[PDB]
Amino acid sequence: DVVVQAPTQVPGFLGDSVTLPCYLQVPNMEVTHVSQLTWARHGESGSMAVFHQTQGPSYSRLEFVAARLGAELRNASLRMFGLRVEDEGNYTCLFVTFPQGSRSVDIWLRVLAKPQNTAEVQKVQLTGEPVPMARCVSTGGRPPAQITWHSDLGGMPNTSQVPGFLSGTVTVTSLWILVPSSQVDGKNVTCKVEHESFEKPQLLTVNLTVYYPPEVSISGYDNNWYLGQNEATLTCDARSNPEPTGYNWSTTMGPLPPFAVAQGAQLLIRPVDKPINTTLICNVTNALGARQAELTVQVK
């Protein structure tokens, strides 16, 4: 009924120290005599750490945290200082007991490294071919962190792995690829980074910034314009990144007639007593360039 209590795996961080738990659970009425404790690495020929009941400790860095001469050996927990990449592997914790014999457990040591997560926006213009608009970097992680994108827009990710600054670590860089459009600028895309060192997955959000020429539109006219009508107003609906730096009003036949007066981004229509047929043009200027929008105006 004498059992050895220890976990199957133990997480330890690179550079720091880790305690390998290993305890011998003996029922209250049972009598046992632990002659010695043994720590061994899978396929290393010789022993790593030994604690004999009369001789004491012997190591190859390593220290028995609870073992002591005089007291009955039960806690074979060992502290491993300065965790290296080569320290990751399988370890055996053996108890040489009497009359129960040899009892052991196999513990896996997992060498980890907490990665540094950073998200960035990629400022792009308008082109046919798909180009990365977002960037997610998970620098110096062990094992390489899992990066996924949470977006309803539907963009294929370009994920690549590169060696880290420290030995045994990997930096994961993921680019969110999508065809740039006007109905995408301002929308958010969330990056989900997953790693064993994190209790909860780190969520990083980036707001897409697409540079597009003015998407100029003209609304107000509805053909129902009678002679000697009320002072109507036409608005030049424009959406551009960066914002418009000017609003110019004109026609195909030259400048604005006396009834049409420019009010910046708006245009006031004064009452007319004679029939007119003029096609108004709204010119919206931006850093990228200028775009036009035409509308036929008929009064009868």
Partner: protein, 109 residues
């Protein structure tokens, strides 16, 4: 240290599986066990605590320890049958030589 060996015998045969070793210091403990689906312990010997037979009291002719700091850890099997066939492992704990292991695969033909 870590050796595997095949032993062939017939019905009604006698065999002595011996684990011979030498220490610079002293022998800590030694055991005999049959390994199948589980590790079924047969006998344990300690120089201070003595012997321990997992089964019944008449185990006098089952194991022997012959002691220059040299030893012979023997398991005796007499008038064997097909049920005796299997893998028998011996574990020798030495100081400061460590743990020695020898597996005997006994086959009854």
């Amino acid at each position: 240290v870590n050796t595997e060996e095949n032993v062939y015998a017939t019905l009604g045969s006698d065999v002595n599986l011996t684990c011979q070793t030498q220490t610079v210091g002293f022998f800590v403990q030694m055991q005999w066990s049959k390994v199948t689906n589980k590790i079924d312990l047969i006998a344990v010997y300690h120089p201070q605590y003595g012997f321990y037979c997992a089964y019944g009291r008449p185990c006098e002719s089952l194991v022997t320890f012959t002691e220059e700091n040299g030893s012979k850890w023997t398991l005796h099997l007499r008038n064997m049958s097909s049920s005796v066939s299997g893998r028998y492992e011996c574990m020798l704990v030495l100081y400061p030589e460590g743990i020695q292991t020898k597996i005997y695969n006994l086959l009854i033909q």
